Design a protein around this ligand. Sequence first.
Ligand code: ZN
Ligand code: ZN
Lengths: 370, 370
Amino acid sequence: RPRFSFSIAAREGKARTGTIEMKRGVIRTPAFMPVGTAAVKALKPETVRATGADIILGNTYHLMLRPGAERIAKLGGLHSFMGWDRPILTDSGGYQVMSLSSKQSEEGVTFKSHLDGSRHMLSPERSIEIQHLLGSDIVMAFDECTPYPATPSRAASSMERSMRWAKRSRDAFDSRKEQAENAALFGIQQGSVFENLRQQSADALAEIGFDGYAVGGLAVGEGQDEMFRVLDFSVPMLPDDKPHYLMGVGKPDDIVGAVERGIDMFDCVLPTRSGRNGQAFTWDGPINIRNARFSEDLKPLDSECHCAVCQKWSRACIHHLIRAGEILGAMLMTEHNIAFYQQLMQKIRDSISEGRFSQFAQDFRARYFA
Amino acid sequence: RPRFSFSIAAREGKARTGTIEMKRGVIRTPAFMPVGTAAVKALKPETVRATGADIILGNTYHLMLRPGAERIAKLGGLHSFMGWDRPILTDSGGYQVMSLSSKQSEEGVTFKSHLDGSRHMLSPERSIEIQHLLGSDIVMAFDECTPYPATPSRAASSMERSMRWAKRSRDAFDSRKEQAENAALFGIQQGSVFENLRQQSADALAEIGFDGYAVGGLAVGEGQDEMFRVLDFSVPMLPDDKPHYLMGVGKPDDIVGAVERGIDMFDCVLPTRSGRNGQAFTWDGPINIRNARFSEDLKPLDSECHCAVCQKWSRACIHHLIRAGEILGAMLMTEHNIAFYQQLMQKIRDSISEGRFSQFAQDFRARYFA
Ligand SMILES: [Zn+2]
Ligand SMILES: [Zn+2]
């Protein structure tokens, strides 16, 4: 297998299906990537694979806090550490610094650990280095988050700095032989909701050149309609022959709509996090399993789902496990939710390849929102 | 398979190995039974079986609190509810009332739920009924706990009431056709540390007649030496041709010593509970995986253990998962600990059958305590 090869097998409108080939494995696109912070929480990696995941996301910010990137490296890298031998994408660590920790400058950011109060630093160079130490397969350039809403001036300044940081990320990545030869690097488009800034960002990233392009700065409170409007003009600005990654997006209907607009890759904490909190995804919409109406419901979480949980376990049992605070409850909900997500991506891939994705999208929405 | 058949295949001194045959399966003795409260916490039942468990224990007190015995019955019984199709032993619910909840009389006990404050009742009749509703395979007679230390007078009064409750448990069990024909009933020996009371209790229970006999009222703070001394004279009082069950005992060295004194069955929360809390059992004694000395230890929890955890996972990874509070950490520790317990019981069974259990006991202790 090559270091990185993206091949498009079929198209329908803006939607694409294909494969990313990397040394550690093949990724079927459109792809959903479950999120990992040290483990997917409450699942063995074998179970994560069993649900159909081709790749997972590792949270750089959490991993650098504990157990630390250096220690992970000494222990043999992230793949060895979490027992997952297929591709891993790592974020830059930058978003969580903004959202979770407690000085920003052109050089980077210093922050205090939200756990120990210890001091840590991130910059384009240090982010890439940490991602190297983890040994990830797809590395994200380090960028500066733009809050929503943002004035044109603030959005432009943040986008411009992010583009300068994209070049530095690129150079840092290329300067490390082992990393440049074995991993891939994705650039991140910024520019908030402004078309002209999104275009300048797309232009800057294409000029630098990356293996894939993420649309960043969305799913930050703008609502689905505005997100879709921004995707409408933003995705066509990105090179057509490279993967398009929508970061932090994962409601099932968000995903279907984003694919309709040319997105190839997704990650979200939603199926895992909301799994532990009692929300299960079904083809008829999400349900909260804790609700009293399920106390004696012997049906599985979803009647069509092919996952191992739905083959054996009833809503009633999971209802009582979750309400009892039993770990198993969370284990079963999480397995089902991520498996549901993978089945969704499979139906998307099949429908595009068969030229009926538009019809699938309509059928999915009618039933999901009914 | 018969309702209940205990066959002794081999003996060495007071130690025995054999099988209990029941409708739902075969139990290899000496047996260790992992404890379940609604789920084994943090394990799928398939995993529990995979470790070698032939039977598990269900906590009647917790189950009657949530989801409730009646609801479990409506949902198809405990086997269906927790997805375990092999034998299940249920306790009477009586010990936890004393230890966990908040009026005692000759009729039984009333108590307030330690969760909701709701009022509940237990008596020999109601205990047996609840155990019927759960559909368990081995039912424990409802008894009255004797605290340690206890005066001869208090111990005698409690033992005598327990014996009257044993008769009532027996009659209640026999009065239910489906239960009497498909399940087994164990009596419980009381009498604290007093030989004469232990003898009167053994006599009373034998006169009533049960399928198995538990030695109750131990592991209540008396220390291993005193426990072994009480077992020395107590176990020979029980009918030799029926299983001998030591309740709530499960340190590995406790188990080996109890088997030397004629005990066939054990249950304890120790491997599961202490698993979640960072303690792993090894042939060289227990270790606390959270200790800094394991932060970069790439060896498995135990070098000889055949469990799936030890085939893949290092102490270093489990160290960081547990310290991060990750659910997976608890999952892996628990799987290993219960698998270790099953391997211990297997080595005990093999050594007895081969007439070398005395030598095994000595070798085990030397290494475990080294
Ligand atoms: Zn499912
Ligand atoms: Zn093990």
